[PDB]
């Protein structure tokens, strides 16, 4: 139980990366967060809910 | 010390207090990018 | 000695009431600027 | 040294006094 | 002010209010004096408070009297917290001792004409011996400043430079008493004692004092003026 | 229409008609400085020997008790009040007063509030003259030295005794005692504000010989280079353009100012930023964050000790050490 | 972004460029809270990484773990640490909410809405709309009453807060009875700032510091709506310059006079700052100094009331200016000094002879030693002890580096007050740019200055 | 006891006030000033 | 004056003092070709500390 | 050392964000 | 050396506070032309406000 | 007699600072 922690902790790491490479870039890019909403709006909602799943596997480890 | 279920992430956590400084030095890295206009 | 005191409380009341009343008599109109 | 040192200062702080007011008095009634 | 209600008083309302250096005066009891118990008594918290601080200056017609002075020290002054054991006999004869205690009290007076007065007010060894209405004795005066005292100049009994080194030709002849030699032989002073206002029922003493004693004799480059104290006292039996 | 009596004083106080402009911020400057100035010169005359140290020694410090102009000095409080309130009537006599050092505190608390209200009053006459208000902003750095050197250091140790005594020979003791104490010279803020001030002497010298050096020939050599500048004109007095050659084909050209307005912004903040970083500087060793501590760092590989420049710097501090106060210290460890 | 050419400040004074413009000043107050909280929790984890159990939290040169010790958390009797897990999920959920904090900054300095006043009129402000800029006052001064308040249930009914004036040596304790008195709370406020007085720094007990929350969370909270449902009166509009950068020079004063003020606090208080947690004070330490060679002479069989000083004033306990037994040497400028390790021992009449001399503790002795060895001074390369001491001991206290820094920030907030004041002055004057050469004030009025 | 002290020291006085004449002559003086602001009103 | 009179003290003579101390607990590592082998108990040295 | 190691690689991945952003912006369009 | 500093501090903060307008921008620093012959701060105003 | 010396260099150095201010000559601003 704390493997899996491990591994959903490593896994928000890499998406808070790439929230916080890609969203700067999305939101300057010329006319690209109309198209762009997507894949920012999955990662957004992907980092919320790898936080929530580290924080309720938090106290299963 | 860190729990042991997060020990391995001590060492990213280590970086985490330089980044304000990486900011500001980010904000002058835009200005530069702009050519100061 | 307690008149001294009376005295030097007295002074210093009236000098900052005349500093806090004068910055309270509209002193941005003592502007010699426009506006 | 009492005043020996009272008669140099005295010395000092005239001579050179004295010859700046004969300047500032020549240059200052001449209008 | 009675040692009652200054025990039910706590610190923060003694503090700089000046409580804290005066003595406890009771209120109970008669002035009898005689009406205490004689026996043996080992009495406790000795106090000692100065009213007035008097010093033998004048030459002039007055013929070495006593003149008041102004206190250049805050309130520094007043002694308590003192040990001892007096024993009393059925006829009044009365003997008393001070041993150990906040005995002394660095303290500089004001002579008009701005000259400075320092002494250390001491009752330290007392050997008191008389009856209830007076009893007197001697006691040790210890010098002032210690030996490991330095002086503008370095100096000092203990440790110093033993002499003027600023100036490497003029270290003897005349100024012997200043470097060469640095005194610090206690002297003795003599104290008088009046018992008033007994309280048997708690065994609480009080009345006045009479202290003359010296004032500081430094290394003996002035002599020690005669320095005269007058105040209160207070003790408390067993 | 400006009858009433508190309009005519507000007119009176707000006007820039006086030789000397008095200001909102002039009515609490001028009478405490007043004060300050007055206490200050009576002190120095015939101030009575002070106990600084608390041991009762006193230190006599005035002129009518035997000093001369150098040694004379206005002595800080006695260190019995530290930090305590001790004005006139606080003392039960004016003896007392004086020998615990109260004029020390009235000084320092009236010049406290003299150069803060200077400061407020500089502000002012930059506002009523239609100028730009900064001049109090540059003004701001000594007021900065002069208040951790006489209220900051002493909360930081917790006494006033522990000042700047007011006065030249007082000054010398007060910086070696502190070099004993804090080790200033190794500390970054006090060597900012020592390259401000060598900096600030190489900045007047530079900016005073390139103006009088490009200044326009409009006299003759019998007659003073000043007397031909006439005030209150608009023709330029000297070549910008000139200087300016001089200083690139001097030093560098791509790093020289060729701007007047950043030359001058340059020549004001540079000594005003240093002189405020070691005034921080003093106030941090107030709280005793003290500077570089280097004693025994320079270490063979047999671990004995290499001495170096520094360990004689700490021979040098420890010279001051066990002598500073010399009859003031019952214990080692001198952590008041 | 925009230029130098189209608003006239340079990029040395770009914030001056988002004056004007609504929507990216909110992104920068977002993102900049954001960047505050991602280093309240950053530090937090750093800190709890580096955290030693075995060694008290001020020689491991932590600032923020002592901040969430005194609230009473992973705390027992002592000052001893139980648990670190409170402190990092405190650091774990204050980078949570960096991390939306930053993203909401971000998406307004980039892509929010220029100015806010044509499409959203709640958010909506210009500078001289008085009523507005006084419902947004208002709006955050009930911000800052709630959170006054859920400080003190935080104390209340929430685990209490660590009382470091308990008996045995401080423990967490449950506040009851806060003192809402309103003479006793504003005599602190009315208070001299000098020894003796402290101004608000000398608070001694939870019970004022909890009391004086209460008053401060309700006074701000009725301000607030006060502020919310009026305007400011004419005298105060006559008064006062209303531009932002005015607005911003009143805060640069209050944050100046809050950054002495605690800097005052973190050097001189004990109660709020438990020395268990922040390390002995100057005036702490020092008293405990002599208070360590005190009981070592005693126990070496050497009178403690008498045996006098070289210089005859006394070498353990002699006489305060006021008359109360203090502890000799140059200590005595710390005679105001009250610790949870003294009063046991202090009568009415200050430093009891008879309860030093028998109502003494050994877990006082030992405080005392250890804050004798952890004295406040030290060297900015953390070296221990006075400038002269050797590079052995690694250890700066947190107290003095707390202070340091914040008279350090608050000094130059203060010159920030100053220029940002001036600045403002000119700017609603009209002189902020220079003189308009043929308006000359001077050559208005006539000669001889 | 010597001699006569105020003493004032410490025991947070308000505005370091320890006979109501201080605090009395404080109100006197802050609203006669203020009594006459409030009187010079109206002008410029 | 001082000489005469040892109750006459000033911040002259304070830093005369400390300069004593300067050139005491300098000389004997700051001038090695004087070989000063100077012994604790002549260095001078106030009240502890 | 695995920490060491760590603390680098992380140290130089966050280092690089910055320029990597404001590299990709430049080179991508612009609006920066 | 201390006058030296006082005197360049004062006199940098005395000159970029007695500016002349010469504006229609913020930045002061870009209101200046090296090839003119007329004084860009008030030497008027300036000794009449010291 | 040192001290009268230095008291009186002192009050003519401020009387040369009070002198210096009020009776300067005036700018000509001509
Ligand atoms: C009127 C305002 C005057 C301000 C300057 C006067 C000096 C004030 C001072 O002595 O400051 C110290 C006081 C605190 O005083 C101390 O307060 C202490 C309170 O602690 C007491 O109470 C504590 C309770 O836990 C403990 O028990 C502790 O042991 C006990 O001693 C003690 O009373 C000390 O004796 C006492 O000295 O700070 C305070 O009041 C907080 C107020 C902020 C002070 C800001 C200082 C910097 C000021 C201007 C800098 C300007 C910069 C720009 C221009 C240049
Ligand atoms: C929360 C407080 C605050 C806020 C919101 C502002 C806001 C503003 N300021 Mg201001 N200022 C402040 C405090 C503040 N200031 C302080 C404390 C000072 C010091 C006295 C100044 C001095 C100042 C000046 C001189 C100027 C401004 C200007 C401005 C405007 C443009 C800022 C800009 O883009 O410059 C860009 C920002 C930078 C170039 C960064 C500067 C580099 C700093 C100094 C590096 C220091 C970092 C270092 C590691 C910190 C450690 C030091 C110490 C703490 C140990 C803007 C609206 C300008 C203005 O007036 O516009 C109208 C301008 O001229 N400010
Ligand atoms: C507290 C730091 C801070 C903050 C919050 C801001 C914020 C802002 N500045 Mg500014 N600035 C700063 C410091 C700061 N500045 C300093 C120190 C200087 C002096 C060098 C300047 C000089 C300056 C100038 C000259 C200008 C601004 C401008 C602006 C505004 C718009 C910038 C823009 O959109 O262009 C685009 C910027 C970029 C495309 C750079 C992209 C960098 C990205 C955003 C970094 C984000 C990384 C982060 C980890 C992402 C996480 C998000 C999420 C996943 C959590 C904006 C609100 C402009 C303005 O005034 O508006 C009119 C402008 O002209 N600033
Ligand atoms: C930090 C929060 C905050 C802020 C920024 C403001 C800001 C403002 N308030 Mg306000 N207020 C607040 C909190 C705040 N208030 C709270 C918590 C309350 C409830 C008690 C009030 C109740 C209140 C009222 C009733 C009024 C204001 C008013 C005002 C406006 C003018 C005040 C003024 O002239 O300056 C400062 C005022 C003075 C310098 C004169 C007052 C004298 C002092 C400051 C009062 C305290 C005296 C006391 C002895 C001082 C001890 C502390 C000191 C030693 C440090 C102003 C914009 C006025 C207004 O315009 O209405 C909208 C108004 O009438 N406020
Ligand atoms: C500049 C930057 C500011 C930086 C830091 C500011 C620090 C602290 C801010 C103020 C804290 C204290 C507030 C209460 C003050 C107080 O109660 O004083 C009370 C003290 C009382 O002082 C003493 O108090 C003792 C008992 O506590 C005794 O009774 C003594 O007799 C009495 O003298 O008075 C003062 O010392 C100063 C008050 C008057 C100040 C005059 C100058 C005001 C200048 C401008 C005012 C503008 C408006
Ligand atoms: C715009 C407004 C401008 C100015 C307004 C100023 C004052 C307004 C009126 C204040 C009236 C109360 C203060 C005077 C008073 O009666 O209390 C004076 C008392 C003085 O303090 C008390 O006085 C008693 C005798 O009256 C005792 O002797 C003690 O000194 C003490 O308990 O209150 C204070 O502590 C002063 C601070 C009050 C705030
Ligand atoms: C050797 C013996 C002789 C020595 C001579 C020493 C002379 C010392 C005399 C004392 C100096 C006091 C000056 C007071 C002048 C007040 C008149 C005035 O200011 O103008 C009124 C003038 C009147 O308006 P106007 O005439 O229309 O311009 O303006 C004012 O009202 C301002 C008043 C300022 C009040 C502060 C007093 C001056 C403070 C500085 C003095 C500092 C004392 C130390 C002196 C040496 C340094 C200068
Ligand atoms: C130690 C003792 C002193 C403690 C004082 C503490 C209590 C007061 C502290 C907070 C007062 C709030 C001030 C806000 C108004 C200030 C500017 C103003 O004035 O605003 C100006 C405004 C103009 O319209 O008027 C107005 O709004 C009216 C506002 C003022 C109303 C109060 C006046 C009180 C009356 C006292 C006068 C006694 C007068 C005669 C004394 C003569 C003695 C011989
Ligand atoms: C009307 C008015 C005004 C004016 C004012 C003036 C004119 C000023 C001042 C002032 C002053 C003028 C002050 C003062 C003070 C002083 C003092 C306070 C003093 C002192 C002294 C002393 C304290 C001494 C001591 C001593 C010593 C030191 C030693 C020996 C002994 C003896 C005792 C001698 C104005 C315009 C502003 C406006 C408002 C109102
Ligand atoms: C929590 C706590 C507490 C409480 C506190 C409090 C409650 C506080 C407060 C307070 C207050 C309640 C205050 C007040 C204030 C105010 C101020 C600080 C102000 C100001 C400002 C100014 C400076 C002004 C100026 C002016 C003038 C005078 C003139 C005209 C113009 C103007 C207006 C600008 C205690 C300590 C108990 C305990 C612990 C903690
Ligand atoms: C606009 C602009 C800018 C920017 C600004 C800012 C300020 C930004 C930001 C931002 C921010 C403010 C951010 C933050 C963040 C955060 C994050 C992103 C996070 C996270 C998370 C995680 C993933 C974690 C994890 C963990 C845990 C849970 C615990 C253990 C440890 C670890 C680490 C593992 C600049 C200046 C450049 C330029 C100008 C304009
Ligand atoms: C991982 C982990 C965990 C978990 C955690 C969780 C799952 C949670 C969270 C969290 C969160 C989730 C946080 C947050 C954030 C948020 C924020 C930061 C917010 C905000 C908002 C605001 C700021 C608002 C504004 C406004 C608006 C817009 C409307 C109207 C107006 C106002 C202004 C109010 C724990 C610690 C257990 C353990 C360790 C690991
Ligand atoms: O008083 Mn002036 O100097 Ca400040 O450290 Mn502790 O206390 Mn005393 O010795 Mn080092
Ligand atoms: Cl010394
Ligand atoms: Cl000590
Ligand atoms: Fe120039």
Same mark, same amino acid.
């Given at each position: 139980?704390?493997?899996?922690?491990?591994?959903?902790?490593?896994?928000?790491?890499?998406?808070?990366?790439?929230?916080?490479?890609?969203?700067?870039?999305?939101?300057?890019?010329?006319?690209?967060?109309?198209?762009?909403?997507?894949?920012?709006?999955?990662?957004?909602?992907?980092?919320?809910?790898?936080?929530?799943?580290?924080?309720?596997?938090?106290?299963?480890? | 010390?860190?729990?042991?279920?997060?020990?391995?992430?001590?060492?990213?956590?280590?970086?985490?207090?330089?980044?304000?400084?990486?900011?500001?030095?980010?904000?002058?890295?835009?200005?530069?990018?702009?050519?100061?206009? | 000695?307690?008149?001294?005191?009376?005295?030097?409380?007295?002074?210093?009341?009236?000098?900052?009431?005349?500093?806090?009343?004068?910055?309270?008599?509209?002193?941005?109109?003592?502007?010699?600027?426009?506006? | 040294?009492?005043?020996?040192?009272?008669?140099?200062?005295?010395?000092?702080?005239?001579?050179?006094?004295?010859?700046?007011?004969?300047?500032?008095?020549?240059?200052?009634?001449?209008? | 002010?009675?040692?009652?209600?200054?025990?039910?008083?706590?610190?923060?309302?003694?503090?700089?209010?000046?409580?804290?250096?005066?003595?406890?005066?009771?209120?109970?009891?008669?002035?009898?004096?005689?009406?205490?118990?004689?026996?043996?008594?080992?009495?406790?918290?000795?106090?000692?408070?100065?009213?007035?601080?008097?010093?033998?200056?004048?030459?002039?017609?007055?013929?070495?009297?006593?003149?008041?002075?102004?206190?250049?020290?805050?309130?520094?002054?007043?002694?308590?917290?003192?040990?001892?054991?007096?024993?009393?006999?059925?006829?009044?004869?009365?003997?008393?001792?001070?041993?150990?205690?906040?005995?002394?009290?660095?303290?500089?007076?004001?002579?008009?004409?701005?000259?400075?007065?320092?002494?250390?007010?001491?009752?330290?060894?007392?050997?008191?011996?008389?009856?209830?209405?007076?009893?007197?004795?001697?006691?040790?005066?210890?010098?002032?400043?210690?030996?490991?005292?330095?002086?503008?100049?370095?100096?000092?009994?203990?440790?110093?430079?033993?002499?003027?080194?600023?100036?490497?030709?003029?270290?003897?002849?005349?100024?012997?008493?200043?470097?060469?030699?640095?005194?610090?032989?206690?002297?003795?002073?003599?104290?008088?004692?009046?018992?008033?206002?007994?309280?048997?029922?708690?065994?609480?003493?009080?009345?006045?004092?009479?202290?003359?004693?010296?004032?500081?004799?430094?290394?003996?480059?002035?002599?020690?003026?005669?320095?005269?104290?007058?105040?209160?006292?207070?003790?408390?039996?067993? | 229409?400006?009858?009433?009596?508190?309009?005519?004083?507000?007119?009176?106080?707000?006007?820039?008609?006086?030789?000397?402009?008095?200001?909102?911020?002039?009515?609490?400057?001028?009478?405490?400085?007043?004060?300050?100035?007055?206490?200050?010169?009576?002190?120095?005359?015939?101030?009575?020997?002070?106990?600084?140290?608390?041991?009762?020694?006193?230190? +006599?410090?005035?002129?009518?008790?035997?000093?001369?102009?150098?040694?004379?000095?206005?002595?800080?409080? +006695?260190?019995?009040?530290?930090?305590?309130?001790?004005?006139?009537?606080?003392?039960?006599?004016?003896?007392?007063?004086?020998?615990?050092?109260?004029?020390?505190?009235?000084?320092?608390?009236?010049?406290?509030?003299?150069?803060?209200?200077? %400061?407020?009053?500089?502000?002012?006459?930059?506002?009523?003259?239609?100028?730009?208000?900064?001049?109090?902003?540059?003004?701001?750095?000594?007021?900065?030295?002069?208040?951790?050197?006489?209220?900051?250091?002493?909360?930081?140790?917790?006494?006033?005794?522990?000042?700047?005594?007011?006065?030249?020979?007082?000054?010398?003791?007060? %910086?070696?005692?502190?070099?004993?104490?804090?080790?200033?010279?190794?500390?970054?803020?006090? %060597?900012?504000?020592?390259?401000?001030?060598?900096?600030?002497?190489?900045?007047?010298?530079?900016?005073?010989?390139?103006?009088?050096? +490009?200044?326009?020939?409009?006299?003759?050599?019998?007659?003073?280079?000043?007397?031909?500048?006439?005030?209150?004109?608009?023709?330029?007095?000297?070549?910008?353009?000139?200087?300016?050659?001089?200083?690139?084909?001097?030093?560098?050209?791509?790093? +020289?100012?060729?701007?007047?307005?950043?030359?001058?912004?340059?020549?004001?903040?540079?000594?005003?930023?240093?002189?405020?970083?070691?005034?921080?500087?003093?106030?941090? %060793?107030?709280?005793?964050?003290?500077?570089?501590?280097?004693?025994?760092?320079?270490?063979?590989?047999?671990?004995?000790?290499?001495?170096?420049?520094?360990?004689?710097?700490?021979?040098?501090?420890?010279?001051?050490?066990?002598?500073?106060?010399?009859?003031?210290?019952?214990?080692?460890?001198?952590?008041? | 972004?925009?230029?130098?050419?189209?608003?006239?400040?340079?990029?040395?004074?770009?914030?001056?460029?988002?004056?004007?413009?609504?929507?990216?000043?909110?992104?920068?107050?977002?993102?900049?809270?954001?960047?505050?909280?991602?280093?309240?929790?950053?530090?937090?984890?750093?800190?709890?990484?580096? @955290?030693?159990?075995?060694?008290?939290?001020?020689?491991?040169?932590?600032?923020?773990?002592?901040?969430?010790?005194?609230?009473?958390?992973?705390?027992?009797?002592?000052?001893?640490?139980?648990?670190?897990?409170?402190?990092?999920?405190? *650091?774990?959920?204050?980078?949570?909410?960096?991390?939306?904090?930053?993203?909401?900054?971000?998406?307004?300095?980039?892509?929010?809405?220029?100015?806010?006043?044509?499409?959203?009129?709640? @958010?909506?402000?210009?500078?001289?709309?008085?009523?507005?800029?006084?419902?947004?006052?208002?709006?955050?001064?009930?911000?800052?009453?709630?959170?006054?308040?859920?400080?003190?249930?935080?104390?209340?009914?929430?685990?209490?807060?660590?009382?470091?004036?308990?008996? *045995?040596?401080?423990?967490?304790?449950?506040?009851?009875?806060?003192?809402?008195?309103?003479?006793?709370?504003?005599?602190?406020?009315?208070?001299?700032?000098?020894?003796?007085?402290?101004?608000?720094?000398?608070?001694?007990?939870?019970?004022?510091?909890?009391?004086?929350?209460?008053?401060?969370?309700?006074?701000?909270?009725?301000?607030?709506?006060?502020?919310?449902?009026?305007?400011?009166?004419?005298?105060?509009?006559?008064?006062?310059?209303?531009?932002?950068?005015?607005?911003?020079?009143?805060?640069?004063?209050?944050?100046?006079?809050?950054?002495?003020?605690?800097?005052?606090?973190?050097?001189?208080? &004990?109660?709020?700052?438990?020395?268990?947690?922040?390390?002995?004070?100057?005036?702490?330490?020092?008293?405990?100094?002599?208070?360590?060679?005190?009981?070592?002479?005693?126990?070496?069989?050497?009178?403690?009331?008498?045996?006098?000083?070289?210089?005859?004033?006394?070498?353990?306990?002699?006489?305060?200016?006021?008359?109360?037994?203090?502890?000799?040497?140059?200590?005595?400028?710390?005679?105001? @000094?009250?610790?949870?390790?003294?009063?046991?021992?202090?009568?009415?009449?200050?430093?009891?002879?008879?309860?030093?001399? &028998?109502?003494?503790?050994?877990?006082?002795?030992?405080?005392?030693?250890?804050?004798?060895?952890?004295?406040?001074? *030290?060297?900015?390369?953390?070296?221990?002890?006075?400038?002269?001491?050797?590079?052995?001991?690694?250890?700066?206290?947190?107290?003095?580096?707390?202070?340091?820094?914040?008279?350090?920030?608050?000094?130059? @907030?203060?010159?920030?007050?100053?220029?940002?004041?001036?600045?403002?002055?000119?700017?609603?004057?009209?002189?902020?740019?220079?003189?308009?050469?043929?308006?000359?004030?001077?050559?208005?009025?006539?000669?001889?200055? | 006891?010597?001699?006569?002290?105020?003493?004032?020291?410490?025991?947070?006085?308000?505005?370091?006030?320890?006979?109501?004449?201080?605090?009395?002559?404080?109100?006197?003086?802050?609203?006669?000033?203020?009594?006459?602001?409030?009187?010079?009103?109206?002008?410029? | 004056?001082?000489?005469?009179?040892?109750?006459?003290?000033?911040?002259?003579?304070?830093?005369?003092?400390?300069? #004593?101390?300067?050139?005491?607990?300098?000389?004997?590592?700051?001038?090695?070709?004087?070989?000063?082998?100077?012994?604790? #108990?002549?260095?001078?040295?106030?009240?502890?500390? | 050392?695995?920490?060491?190691?760590?603390?680098?690689?992380?140290?130089?991945?966050?280092?690089?964000?910055?320029?990597?952003?404001?590299?990709?912006?430049?080179?991508?369009?612009?609006?920066? | 050396?201390?006058?030296?500093?006082?005197?360049?501090?004062?006199?940098?903060?005395?000159?970029?506070?007695?500016?002349?307008?010469?504006?229609?921008?913020?930045?002061?620093?870009?209101?200046?032309?090296?090839?003119?012959?007329?004084?860009?701060?008030?030497?008027?105003?300036?000794?009449?406000?010291? | 007699?040192?001290?009268?010396?230095?008291?009186?260099?002192?009050?003519?150095?401020?009387?040369?600072?009070?002198?210096?201010?009020?009776?300067?000559?005036?700018?000509?601003?001509?």
């Amino acid at each position: 139980m704390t493997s899996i922690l491990q591994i959903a902790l490593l896994g928000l790491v890499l998406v808070s990366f790439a929230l916080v490479v890609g969203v700067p870039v999305v939101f300057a890019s010329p006319n690209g967060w109309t198209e762009n909403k997507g894949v920012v709006f999955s990662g957004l909602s992907v980092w919320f809910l790898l936080v929530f799943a580290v924080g309720v596997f938090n106290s299963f480890a | 010390k860190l729990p042991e279920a997060y020990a391995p992430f001590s060492p990213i956590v280590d970086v985490l207090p330089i980044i304000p400084v990486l900011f500001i030095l980010l904000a002058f890295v835009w200005q530069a990018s702009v050519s100061f206009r | 000695m307690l008149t001294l005191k009376i005295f030097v409380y007295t002074v210093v009341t009236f000098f900052v009431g005349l500093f806090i009343f004068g910055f309270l008599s509209n002193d941005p109109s003592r502007n010699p600027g426009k506006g | 040294v009492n005043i020996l040192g009272l008669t140099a200062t005295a010395l000092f702080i005239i001579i050179p006094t004295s010859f700046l007011l004969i300047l500032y008095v020549k240059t200052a009634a001449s209008e | 002010l009675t040692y009652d209600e200054l025990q039910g008083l706590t610190y923060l309302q003694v503090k700089g209010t000046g409580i804290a250096n005066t003595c406890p005066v009771v209120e109970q009891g008669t002035s009898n004096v005689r009406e205490l118990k004689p026996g043996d008594y080992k009495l406790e918290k000795f106090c000692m408070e100065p009213t007035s601080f008097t010093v033998k200056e004048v030459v002039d017609k007055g013929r070495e009297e006593f003149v008041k002075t102004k206190l250049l020290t805050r309130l520094t002054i007043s002694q308590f917290g003192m040990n001892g054991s007096m024993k009393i006999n059925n006829d009044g004869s009365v003997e008393f001792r001070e041993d150990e205690g906040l005995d002394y009290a660095a303290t500089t007076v004001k002579l008009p004409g701005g000259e400075y007065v320092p002494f250390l007010f001491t009752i330290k060894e007392f050997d008191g011996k008389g009856t209830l209405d007076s009893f007197s004795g001697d006691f040790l005066v210890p010098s002032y400043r210690g030996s490991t005292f330095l002086d503008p100049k370095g100096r000092g009994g203990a440790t110093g430079y033993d002499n003027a080194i600023a100036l490497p030709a003029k270290a003897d002849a005349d100024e012997i008493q200043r470097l060469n030699n640095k005194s610090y032989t206690p002297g003795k002073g003599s104290a008088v004692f009046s018992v008033a206002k007994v309280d048997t029922e708690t065994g609480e003493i009080a009345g006045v004092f009479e202290s003359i004693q010296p004032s500081d004799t430094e290394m003996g480059a002035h002599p020690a003026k005669d320095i005269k104290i007058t105040g209160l006292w207070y003790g408390q039996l067993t | 229409e400006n009858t009433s009596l508190w309009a005519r004083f507000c007119e009176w106080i707000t006007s820039t008609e006086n030789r000397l402009y008095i200001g909102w911020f002039g009515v609490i400057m001028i009478p405490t400085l007043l004060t300050a100035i007055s206490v200050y010169i009576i002190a120095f005359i015939a101030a009575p020997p002070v106990d600084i140290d608390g041991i009762r020694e006193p230190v +006599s410090g005035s002129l009518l008790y035997g000093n001369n102009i150098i040694t004379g000095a206005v002595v800080p409080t +006695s260190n019995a009040i530290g930090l305590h309130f001790y004005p006139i009537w606080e003392a039960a006599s004016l003896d007392e007063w004086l020998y615990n050092g109260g004029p020390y505190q009235l000084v320092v608390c009236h010049f406290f509030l003299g150069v803060c209200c200077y %400061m407020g009053r500089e502000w002012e006459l930059s506002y009523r003259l239609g100028m730009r208000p900064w001049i109090a902003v540059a003004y701001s750095a000594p007021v900065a030295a002069a208040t951790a050197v006489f209220i900051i250091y002493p909360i930081g140790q917790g006494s006033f005794s522990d000042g700047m005594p007011l006065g030249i020979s007082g000054t010398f003791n007060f %910086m070696i005692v502190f070099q004993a104490e804090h080790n200033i010279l190794m500390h970054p803020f006090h %060597m900012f504000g020592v390259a401000g001030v060598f900096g600030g002497s190489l900045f007047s010298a530079m900016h005073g010989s390139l103006v009088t050096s +490009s200044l326009i020939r409009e006299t003759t050599e019998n007659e003073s280079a000043n007397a031909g500048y006439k005030f209150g004109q608009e023709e330029e007095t000297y070549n910008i353009v000139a200087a300016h050659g001089y200083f690139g084909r001097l030093i560098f050209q791509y790093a +020289s100012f060729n701007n007047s307005r950043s030359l001058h912004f340059f020549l004001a903040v540079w000594p005003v930023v240093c002189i405020w970083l070691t005034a921080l500087g003093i106030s941090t %060793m107030a709280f005793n964050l003290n500077g570089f501590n280097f004693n025994q760092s320079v270490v063979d590989s047999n671990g004995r000790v290499l001495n170096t420049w520094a360990d004689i710097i700490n021979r040098a501090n420890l010279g001051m050490e066990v002598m500073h106060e010399r009859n003031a210290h019952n214990f080692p460890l001198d952590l008041a | 972004g925009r230029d130098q050419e189209t608003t006239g400040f340079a990029w040395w004074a770009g914030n001056a460029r988002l004056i004007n413009l609504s929507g990216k000043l909110l992104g920068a107050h977002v993102a900049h809270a954001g960047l505050i909280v991602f280093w309240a929790g950053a530090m937090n984890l750093f800190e709890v990484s580096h @955290f030693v159990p075995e060694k008290p939290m001020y020689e491991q040169g932590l600032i923020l773990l002592p901040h969430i010790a005194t609230l009473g958390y992973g705390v027992g009797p002592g000052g001893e640490v139980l648990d670190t897990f409170p402190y990092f999920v405190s *650091g774990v959920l204050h980078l949570i909410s960096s991390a939306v904090l930053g993203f909401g900054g971000v998406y307004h300095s980039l892509i929010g809405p220029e100015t806010l006043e044509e499409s959203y009129p709640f @958010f909506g402000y210009v500078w001289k709309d008085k009523n507005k800029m006084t419902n947004i006052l208002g709006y955050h001064l009930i911000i800052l009453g709630c959170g006054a308040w859920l400080l003190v249930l935080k104390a209340l009914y929430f685990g209490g807060v660590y009382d470091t004036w308990a008996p *045995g040596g401080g423990d967490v304790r449950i506040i009851s009875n806060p003192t809402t008195n309103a003479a006793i709370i504003f005599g602190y406020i009315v208070k001299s700032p000098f020894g003796g007085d402290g101004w608000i720094v000398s608070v001694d007990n939870l019970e004022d510091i909890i009391g004086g929350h209460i008053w401060i969370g309700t006074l701000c909270i009725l301000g607030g709506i006060w502020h919310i449902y009026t305007t400011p009166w004419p005298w105060a509009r006559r008064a006062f310059v209303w531009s932002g950068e005015a607005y911003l020079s009143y805060s640069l004063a209050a944050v100046s006079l809050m950054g002495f003020t605690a800097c005052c606090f973190a050097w001189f208080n &004990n109660t709020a700052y438990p020395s268990e947690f922040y390390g002995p004070t100057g005036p702490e330490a020092s008293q405990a100094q002599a208070f360590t060679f005190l009981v070592r002479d005693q126990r070496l069989g050497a009178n403690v009331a008498s045996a006098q000083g070289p210089t005859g004033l006394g070498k353990y306990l002699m006489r305060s200016p006021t008359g109360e037994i203090i502890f000799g040497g140059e200590t005595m400028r710390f005679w105001d @000094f009250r610790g949870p390790w003294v009063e046991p021992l202090r009568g009415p009449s200050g430093l009891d002879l008879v309860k030093l001399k &028998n109502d003494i503790q050994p877990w006082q002795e030992r405080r005392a030693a250890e804050y004798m060895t952890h004295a406040p001074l *030290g060297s900015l390369n953390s070296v221990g002890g006075v400038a002269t001491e050797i590079n052995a001991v690694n250890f700066v206290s947190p107290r003095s580096w707390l202070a340091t820094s914040h008279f350090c920030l608050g000094f130059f @907030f203060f010159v920030g007050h100053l220029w940002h004041a001036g600045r403002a002055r000119a700017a609603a004057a009209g002189f902020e740019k220079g003189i308009d050469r043929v308006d000359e004030p001077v050559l208005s009025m006539r000669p001889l200055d | 006891l010597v001699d006569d002290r105020m003493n004032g020291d410490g025991t947070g006085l308000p505005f370091g006030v320890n006979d109501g004449i201080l605090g009395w002559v404080i109100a006197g003086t802050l609203g006669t000033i203020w009594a006459i602001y409030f009187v010079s009103q109206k002008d410029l | 004056r001082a000489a005469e009179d040892p109750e006459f003290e000033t911040f002259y003579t304070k830093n005369i003092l400390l300069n #004593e101390g300067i050139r005491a607990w300098m000389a004997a590592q700051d001038q090695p070709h004087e070989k000063l082998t100077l012994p604790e #108990e002549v260095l001078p040295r106030g009240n502890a500390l | 050392s695995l920490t060491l190691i760590l603390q680098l690689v992380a140290l130089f991945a966050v280092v690089a964000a910055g320029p990597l952003v404001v590299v990709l912006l430049s080179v991508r369009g612009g609006n920066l | 050396v201390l006058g030296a500093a006082l005197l360049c501090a004062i006199h940098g903060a005395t000159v970029e506070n007695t500016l002349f307008e010469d504006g229609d921008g913020a930045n002061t620093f870009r209101a200046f032309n090296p090839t003119q012959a007329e004084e860009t701060y008030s030497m008027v105003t300036a000794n009449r406000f010291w | 007699m040192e001290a009268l010396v230095y008291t009186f260099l002192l009050i003519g150095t401020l009387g040369i600072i009070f002198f210096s201010i009020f009776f300067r000559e005036p700018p000509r601003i001509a």
